[PDB]
Design a protein around this ligand. Structure first.
Ligand SMILES: O=C(O)[C@@](O)(COP(=O)(O)O)[C@H](O)[C@H](O)COP(=O)(O)O
Ligand SMILES: O=C(O)[C@@](O)(COP(=O)(O)O)[C@H](O)[C@H](O)COP(=O)(O)O
Ligand SMILES: O=C(O)[C@@](O)(COP(=O)(O)O)[C@H](O)[C@H](O)COP(=O)(O)O
Ligand SMILES: [Ca+2]
Ligand SMILES: [Ca+2]
Ligand SMILES: [Ca+2]
Lengths: 123, 467, 467, 151, 316, 123
């Protein structure tokens, strides 16, 4: 039997327990986002990469949930290259940042997609 | 319009069988499966049920002249024979809006299901479905949070949530509960839970349990970086006990509590839904006892009725069956009521056992929870049946992994994320599931050990409640 | 005593079928009617039910080694075939005392009836009876007052009590409710009542109702000189609503309130029993919804189980059926559970559907309430079946008398006192009932009019739940 | 259904004048007496009222893309000229049920009569009537007793 | 003194779509606006608690957001959390929860909630140290016409009595009506201790306030970066300037909208304090600041021609 | 579209979004203070440059507001050179301090001026 590790095993919600996504693997989630007519958005975070409680500890309140918005939601977008381009731009501007791709459904007003698309060095 | 008072008994169908009636958009509509005794017209059986579930009794009372009995009466307005049954009929009843107490699931069940199932002149009776009009919908809080809010609170998107009941159902001490909890959450499950009948007992007192499971869960969050919860059962003997568990959960700062709505009861449930809305606790509903009422085709209440009343009273989560596991749940029926649980509009659909079109006027949807003898091999089928807005709950599928809780959790979390990825890529979960799972074991030795243990385990029997 | 951990699924009968087991005097004992699927040994079906109602799940979990699974486990310790049924067995289960939360009917039902009735491998399942050990009995308050105290409070001895539901079940205004109430109490009924589904509605708001029915009942007491009550329904959507009705009843100074224990729910019931004990209000229990669970032989929970749990939770009164009226109730079964409701000791008796000897360690007895399509002609039979410690309740039998409420009440009160006198004189109520009633009409023109109206009315059908 | 975000101001009637709309039985319907400035089409005056009592402001905001602005927007769905007045119109507005807080008169009036009566582009404005759908009616207690009980 | 902000008008911003945004999206929009240099953001008047967004959820996420803005920028922020409600008990539950999260400022719609319930809230915020921002929704139902109703100076004086730390006061130059002279009028009534009779500005009586604290006027409604000069000259330092559409309508999104706004305002303050004439040199001062602020440049291109000029109704 | 930066973008209230004040620019704010007859005061802070919550988190309570006063408020002052002189003295004594100039109106008892006049190295 194996012991599941303890140190440096920070995880990043959906997809983070699979092998790192390949370039195509990455493409395919982006297509999946766009095939469901959801709106792409990028978000990034330099300082607080994981949730914490600084300002309150009542039920349902966590810090570190909000990241910062890269540019605006890509409304209209039908081209995955557009999204992967913006990922490259965000990366070049913020190479010490975690960067995630999210996908909005506006009918339900819920994020239907959210995954990590880039982690900084040592991550 | 007055007529003299003539004491004595008449047929119910004289007043309460009204075939030509056009239902109003404010009426509550019931669908009964009715099995009359020999000698009893379906009309009169239909009529009986409507009368004694709304205004009438077994003989003429004079006090009806004081009111306008036409505007208050329940009405049997359509009968239809049941296919492949001797002497069995669907009877539809409309109940006017005024009959009901605003915001009380208790009062709606007290009329509609109060006394009629014991009538001598029926062999059997079963509430299949109910059409709650929108103006009655608006009198209830509903879910404390609902799917959108819950996902935004926990920061969890793109997949089913994963849960795990602590096992031995009973007999573990607090500190051991806490130990099991940390181990399970740190391997990738989002939630763990009190077993339904774990309340407070001689082997484990509640306040001790809550305490340690807080430490545990706060340690798993800290190690993994993803938000965790553990369903702390508020179910209790009295309302004052129940409220004491909630308030202590609140005071610890954790995200979620549970309640056993039917064995606690709708009056106390509603109370607890209210307090979690005021206090921002998520509310996981357990449906223990439901099968006492809802198993048989011929007599009882369908689970879709209990779920609708849960959505009114309030739950963020409700168990919904698994289809594939150790408890009964037919796929088509199950798709049915799940749709009734999460969506805003659901059209009539007899193939899925929806007898009424149902609107919810933006009452938040409820997250279905699949739990009960499932395991990694069922992952594909579960993801396909329920989709992303579900909680998948793996008790013996976690704690029975050969390598302990952490690795059991990893196996289940990996199998799930392999099915999501495969799905999102365009693969067919129903066709390719065993394969997908197979592929994932090549790189996850946690999953591989799970897969070896339970390879042959299936649960397939003749179901009882079918369409 | 330790053994290595071997993950994977085994038979339940390996751990949970224990035929040689001698029950302990602290154990809770369940009697299940079990109908296995084809292919499923009665042993394994028995075992399944015991395991998943106490400690076990569908695969081996390692965490059992942390505890002493032998002292906590539910046990199937006896199977016996069912006479005149293919593939149906009584299975007995013993549950240790530690499994249960002191004073919570909710927790005892959550284990014993929580999940097992939905098992795929069963066709059907039914809890017939339960043996609550005395040390568990002592953890509950029971009835707020109980038969002795109730009779001493109201000053009412030597006869059944007489009641009357107000009719039209719904749609009467407050002031009209109050009018009907005064008229009914002033002709000789001891009590009148809120109909179960009369809570607070658009046609009649609760606080208005309580108010006027106080005036009414205070006027009937004043005119007749005997103590009256009117069952003011506290049933409500939430505990806080419920408690508000109780507290206002308390503030008016009246003797008695009611509650719909199953549609309100055991958590809220228990709360209300507590408050009436602290506040000296009598507590009348309505059993609305019971027939949803308890009608069928093959699947559900027998009413004797619901009654026992009511006596623990707390009720001064519970409905118990009438035998002779419009709702189903077999005489022998009914004698059975009535005995379970009022007495301190009740020996095993399969002929009356008592599977267990039952002791109550001076927990006060509960008064049975017969209500439901009865009338003056049934008086003799009712008095014979139930005896003095009962409440006889005549809704359409009061308000459907041709001469109005007062005279309907007199008819029923006279018929009852004629049956008492005749009984006390040494006459046979079963043999001489029609005669006795006949004699009494010669001097009571109220009774005579009742008798003429309902002379032919009988309710006789094939029953469903039999022994 | 998504379209790119184009900042800047547009006519209100492009989003909130909706003459072919069939009112829902849950909507809250407002009857306004509306007197536009010189230069202001009734259609745009009606639309301004509907927008600025419900979802919109004076310039396009990107955050609309995050919701479904069609299901929330107030909608001017009928204009009729007023008899014996120059430049005065009845404008009808439908408000979806979701816009309101249950049981709060204060919330209904804050949307419906909050800001619009000061708009520079109107000379005058008057709320004549409101159609309160029954599902909203049920959220209120109403009269404590009412006529029957009182007597 | 509580917020540690001196030497300029404060800046705020109403979250748009007025209705129909969820709680987590409200928080998102808030964080972005405050991090770009706005002091405050706010519940739209008619955002109370609804099917698309329940209040307790909103407060919670706007706390999270605002605490992240503050922490990134190091300047104190606030978000007016609307206590307006159906009953007093409901209202007081919202104030109590704002108190508990430790934020600085709540709001109330004094006329549709009503003076009784306002005075109750004003008391609580004193006893609990919450700032209290007053919205004046419905006022134009009573105060638009010269011939019939009640002038808005009357409602403002009553709000001063009842209690508000902030009230909306009109803008003059935006989408809602307010004549300059009458506006300087009542703004003086709201802030100063003594205000002499002056029929030219619609003050019919001399009014003393015996050190009753003055109320910060809030200019909001159809304004943008080109109005910055005018606003600064009309209201001076003791004002809150509020840019809903003017923040969330910026082409580059909230943070940049906010930056354009706060840049324009500090340029008018710097210009002013140097001795320039805001009424004469406004367009120029704004023009100059776009040369080094690309955020401002984008805002200025979008709304260059937008003006709001009609015959007013309430005049002297 | 540009993304407003995330790291090292601490701001110092009024004037702190402008380009750094020139020596003349600085003089002009000081004149402005003195032409409204307001009383110059300087304040400095070595340790806690930005607000934080150590001792309480109730509404309206922040730590880090109070800085420490350089000498006294310059009452009577009519000369801007005086103030710029004290700025230079404070700077020489506290080169690792943020220093601000503030302006008191005694009739309203409010600061009517406040701006940063010196930041330490790396600021
Ligand atoms: O005790 C149990 O049996 C379970 O925890 C399953 O444990 P395993 O995860 O070990 O199966 C669940 O409560 C049942 O699934 C309830 O059924 P339902 O969801 O249909 O109400
Ligand atoms: O509504 C009714 O039907 C009753 O009031 C009878 O009215 P009548 O007196 O007019 O028959 C009783 O509640 C039922 O008897 C309940 O049955 P049970 O006692 O078996 O629970
Ligand atoms: O709903 C609106 O219209 C506003 O948020 C302005 O939003 P924009 O910032 O997007 O214009 C303000 O509440 C009005 O200004 C109220 O007017 P007043 O202050 O005159 O009472
Ligand atoms: Ca369980
Ligand atoms: Ca009844
Ligand atoms: Ca607004």
């Amino acid at each position: 039997m194996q012991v599941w590790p303890i140190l440096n095993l920070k995880k990043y919600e959906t997809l983070s327990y699979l092998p790192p996504l390949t370039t195509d693997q990455l493409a395919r989630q982006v297509d999946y986002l766009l095939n469901n007519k959801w709106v792409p958005c990028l978000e990034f975070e330099t300082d607080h990469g994981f949730v914490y409680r600084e300002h309150h500890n009542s039920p349902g309140y966590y810090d570190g949930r909000y990241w910062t918005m890269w540019k605006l939601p890509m409304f209209g977008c039908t081209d995955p290259a557009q999204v992967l381009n913006e990922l490259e731009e965000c990366k070049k501007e913020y190479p010490n940042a975690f960067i995630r791709i999210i996908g909005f459904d506006s009918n339900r007003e819920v994020q239907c997609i959210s995954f990590i698309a880039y982690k900084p060095a040592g991550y | 319009a007055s007529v003299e008072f003539k004491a004595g008994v008449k047929d119910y169908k004289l007043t309460y069988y009204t075939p030509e009636y056009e239902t109003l958009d404010t009426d509550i509509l019931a669908a009964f499966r009715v099995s009359p005794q020999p000698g009893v017209p379906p009309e009169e059986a239909g009529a009986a049920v409507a009368a004694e579930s709304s205004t009438g009794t077994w003989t003429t009372v004079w006090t009806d002249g004081l009111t306008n009995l036409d505007r208050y009466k329940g009405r049997c307005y359509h009968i239809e024979p049941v296919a492949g049954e001797e002497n069995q009929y669907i009877c539809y009843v409309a109940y006017p809006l005024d009959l009901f107490e605003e915001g009380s699931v208790t009062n709606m069940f007290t009329s509609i299901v109060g006394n009629v199932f014991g009538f001598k002149a029926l062999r059997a009776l079963r509430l299949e479905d109910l059409r709650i009009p929108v103006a009655y919908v608006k009198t209830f809080q509903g879910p404390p949070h609902g799917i959108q809010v819950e996902r935004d609170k926990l920061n969890k998107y793109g997949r089913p949530l994963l849960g795990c009941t602590i096992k031995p159902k009973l007999g573990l001490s607090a500190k051991n509960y806490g130990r099991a909890v940390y181990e399970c959450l740190r391997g990738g499950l989002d939630f763990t839970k009190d077993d339904e009948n774990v309340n407070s007992q001689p082997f484990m007192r509640w306040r001790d349990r809550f305490l340690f499971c807080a430490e545990a869960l706060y340690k798993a969050q800290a190690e993994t970086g993803e938000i965790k919860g553990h369903y702390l059962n508020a179910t209790a003997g009295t309302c004052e006990d129940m409220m004491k568990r909630a308030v202590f959960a609140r005071e610890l700062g954790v995200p979620i509590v549970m309640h056993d709505y039917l064995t606690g009861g709708f009056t106390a449930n509603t109370t607890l839904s209210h307090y979690c809305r005021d206090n921002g606790l998520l509310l996981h509903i357990h449906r223990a006892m439901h099968a006492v009422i809802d198993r048989q085709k011929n007599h009882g209440m369908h689970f879709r009725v209990l779920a609708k009343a849960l959505r009114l009273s309030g739950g963020d989560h409700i168990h919904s069956g698994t289809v594939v596991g150790k408890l009964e749940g037919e796929r088509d029926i199950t798709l049915g009521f799940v749709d009734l649980l999460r969506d805003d509009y659901t059209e009539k659909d007899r193939s899925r056992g929806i007898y009424f079109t149902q609107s919810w006027v933006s009452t938040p949807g409820v997250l279905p929870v699949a739990s009960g003898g499932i395991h990694v091999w069922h992952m594909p089928a579960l993801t396909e049946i329920f989709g992303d807005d579900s909680v998948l709950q793996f008790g013996g599928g976690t704690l029975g992994h050969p390598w302990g809780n952490a690795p059991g959790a990893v196996a289940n979390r990996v199998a799930l994320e392999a099915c999501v990825q495969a799905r999102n890529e365009g693969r067919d979960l129903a066709r390719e599931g065993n394969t997908i799972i197979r592929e994932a074991t090549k790189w996850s030795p946690e999953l591989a050990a799970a897969c070896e243990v339970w390879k042959e385990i299936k649960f397939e029997f003749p179901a009882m409640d079918t369409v």
